[model samples]
Structures are given as structure tokens and as C-alpha cells.
Target chain A: VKYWFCYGTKCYYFIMNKTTWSGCKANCQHYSVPIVKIEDEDELKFLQRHVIPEGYWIGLSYDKKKKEWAWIDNGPSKFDMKSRGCVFLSKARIEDTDCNIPYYCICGKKLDKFP
Target chain B: VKYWFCYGTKCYYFIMNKTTWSGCKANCQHYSVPIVKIEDEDELKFLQRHVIPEGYWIGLSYDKKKKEWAWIDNKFDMKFKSRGCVFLSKARIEDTDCNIPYYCICGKKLDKF
Candidate 1:
């Protein structure tokens, strides 16, 4: 496991390896956590403040079938989008970028979950 | 408590923040555990296999008065005039100045929780 830190009820880990969104998703599966799913504005804020300077793939992407944005776990997400792509977590905000582009990623799990 | 992982009968935590050996010594005390003291070759091997690629202060130092290396808690204890504190790396245990800033490893028996 890579370096991980805990906050609130969840522990978050950073994947410093540069890879595509799908690659990170695969790696996170081994840890039994999906690519990070930000639950609220506060969780997003928590991650933004503590994360080492970064751009990370979170568990989000555009759903072409629904023509809407959504989380990997099929959760609701209403982020504005004009161009189509996966999600990016920058130092402060979430942005969209090509899903196949290489970057680091985030993985998260509840305190009760083991990795 | 910080995030920790267990191996065998013990649980260990990694102090990622850099601090002096003395500073980390007290920091680990908050968990009622000392800086890690290797119990045997198997413990050392397990730690060696798991630590990240960085130096982590261990509970070992030179006791100039006794003129022998000693562990803080009557236990793998090393040496240097200016560098008596020992730290763990993925490769092996090594010594450096006691005041040098580095990360730390802390451990205790599982039931100590």
C-alpha cells in the first residue's frame, strides 16, 4: 500500500504513479476501494486541503447514455460539462480531462474497511 | 491515533512527518509504544519488506556512558560520536546524527491497544 492518511470517517490514499483513469481504477480495486468518491463539498474540501500538490482522477465520468455526469458507483453528480471526459481533482477544484490521459489518482475507504 | 498496519502479533504505525530522533521518541509515546524495537530476524525482515523508501528513526542509539549501543527499552540497539541514532530503511538499519530530521516507525503488541 502507498502512503495513506485518515480524516473524518474515511482514510484516503494517493497513487503517485502516473497512469490513465482506467489504470488507476484497476489499481484501486486491489485495495478494495474505488477511485475516490467525494461525498460532499466538505469531503472535497478536506481532500483539497490535505492532498499533496496534485491532479488526481476521482471516481467520476460523463455518462453518454444519460448525457449527464455521474460517479463511478452510479451516484448523483451534477458538475457542469461541455466537453466530454473523466474527472480531475486539482489542488482546488474538479475539472474534466481526457480519460486516457495519464495522471496520479486517489483511493478512499471507510474506517471499517480494510485494505 | 494515526493509521497503522499489523503484522504477526504487533501493530505498527509510520510517522511520515520529518522530525528529530528525540522528537519522534516522544511522539511515539502518545501511542504508548516506543520507536520500533526489532524483536528478531523475522520482525526485521518483515519491516524491511514493508517500509516505504525513506529513513525512519528506530529505538536504537549509542550509550556513551556504557560505551555500547543500546535500545531505549532494554532491547536491536547501534553508533557514531556525532551519529548514534539508528533508522530503518528498505535496505537495512543504519545510523545517523540523533538530531537529524527523518520519519519514524512505532510499534507495540496487538493486545497493547
Candidate 2:
């Protein structure tokens, strides 16, 4: 089962077996968590620690017509899929795949609780 | 030590053994969680479950000059200490007290993570 591990809060949400990028985003919406959005290189490194060497789906998507990569959040422009390729956890190399391909998804939220 | 239990997040924070009403609110601000803000009757019920029978310092406070009981968040208008008396958690009746004295505090935050 694909699961979203919300750090700090230690709450876990499970998604269905394998879901398309759109389907994965919907699940996160229902659970009130936005799809994973990496702010900087530091966060990208942090996620790398959790993923195994597999082509995992991040909060990224491809513009079918423009043939360019875009973040699902459409907020920050840190990484360019066309240049960096699809950066996935666990896997060393990026894979060229369709958005419809099912892959593991990650979600994150701010730490609202303090010690 | 007085502690703040963030229910949804299962995280805790501690304040001084006793602190003035303003001091209590400052501590919560430093910790990122805001002083408790109850949206409706349901939340008030939920909070009642966690509080004991003492006149615990809730997210409520009294205006010194205006002489009115108001929520610390300055947002919702719910319980009034003047009309109803000071309601302590473990204690039954409300009492007239100054905000300078230290009291236990409660804080809450939406589950961000």
C-alpha cells in the first residue's frame, strides 16, 4: 500500500495500490494534505533518504503539449524536469514515463506541534 | 510543569510553573501553536474532557479596564466570566482574580504535519 507519512505528527495515510498522478493528488486533497512540494535542494536531499532505488512519483508533472516538466503545486520553480530529468527517490537515474503511470506518492506538511 | 497537549498532533509543550496570562500566551507563540481558540460548542465540549475540575486557566481572560471576560484569541465570543463567574477546570465556581497571578495554560494548533 502506498502511504503518506506525515512527519512530526506521526500520522499515516494510505492510498490505493497504485494510482495515477491525478488520483494520488485527489487522495491527498481528501486527507487535507497538499501533495509534496520541495522548497529547495535541502528538502530534496531529505526525501532521498526515505526512498529506495525505484522511480517514485514526486509532486511533479509533465505538460503534454509544451513537453516540459512542471511541479504539481505550480508554485515554486526550483527544478526543471526537462533539465534535471524526473528525480525519483531510491532510483539513481530518472525515467521517462507518462503521467498516467502509477507510482508511489509523497506528501508533507508543516510541524504545527512543538515540544 | 504546566504542559500544552496538542491533541491532533500528539505533541506537548511546557510553561513556567506559574505564569501571568500574557506570559502564558507568549510561551505558546514561541512554540508556534497559538493559544487555544475554540470555534464552536463541539470544541468546548472536547476541551472539557481534557480539563480537570480546577479553575484552570483556559484560553479565556478578563479585560482589566473594560471588566469583561473575553477569549484570549480575541476572535470568538463564547463564555463570559462576569455573568457566569470564573469557571475553573477542577473547581466548580468562578472566582475574581487578577491576570498577574500565574495559572496553568492550554494551547491548541491545527495538525500541520
The best candidate by DockQ is 2
Q: Candidate 1 — which residues are off by over 4 angstroms?
A: A74-78, A112-115, B1-113
Clashing pairs in 1: none
> Best candidate, TM-score-wise?
1
Q: In candidate 2 chain B, what residue range of length 10 has the lowest lDDT sum?
A: B84-93
* Per-residue lDDT of model 2, residues B1-113, tens digit only: 65554434334343544555565567677667555555555445545565654444455556666677666656533443553224344323254554545544455543434
lDDT of 1 by residue, A1-115 (tens): 2666655456677888878888677888977777788887767887887777777888887786787777766544455645678888888788888889888878876554222
After the best TM-score superposition of candidate 2, give how far the Cα of residue A4 lies from its true spot, in angstroms. 4.2
